[PDB]
């Protein structure tokens, strides 16, 4: 839900958590780049197999 906080069960205190935008955006952008590269490689292989006409026949 809407609470953005972290509990401390030693002293029993709830601390508000402030998220820095810079690190979060850097992390998400790098993850998106990794996913994009993986998808591009996979579809390059898919294009190769489609061009070469590889498929599974009944026998």
């Amino acid at each position: 839900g809407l609470i953005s906080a972290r509990v401390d069960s030693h002293s029993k205190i709830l601390y508000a958590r402030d998220v820095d935008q810079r690190s979060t955006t850097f992390e998400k952008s790098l993850l998106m780049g990794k996913e994009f590269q993986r998808r591009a490689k996979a579809m390059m292989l898919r294009a190769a197999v489609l061009r070469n006409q590889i498929h599974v026949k009944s026998p």
């Binding site: 205190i13 935008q21 998400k28 952008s29 998106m32 994009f36 996979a42 579809m43």
Partner: protein, 49 residues
């Protein structure tokens, strides 16, 4: 009531007012660009079949 911009620290019995402003617009724009790039890349890849 959004008349005082700050937050209370109960443990130390004080209140801290937000006076520092950072450039979050740049990071919001970068987030939007990243999301749009992700969607566009997925669509372009899915075009080939």
């Amino acid at each position: 009531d959004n008349t005082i911009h700050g937050r209370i620290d109960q443990v130390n019995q004080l209140l801290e007012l937000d006076h520092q402003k950072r450039g979050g617009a740049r990071y919001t724009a970068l987030d939007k660009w990243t999301n749009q790039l992700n969607s566009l890349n997925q669509a372009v890849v899915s075009k080939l079949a």
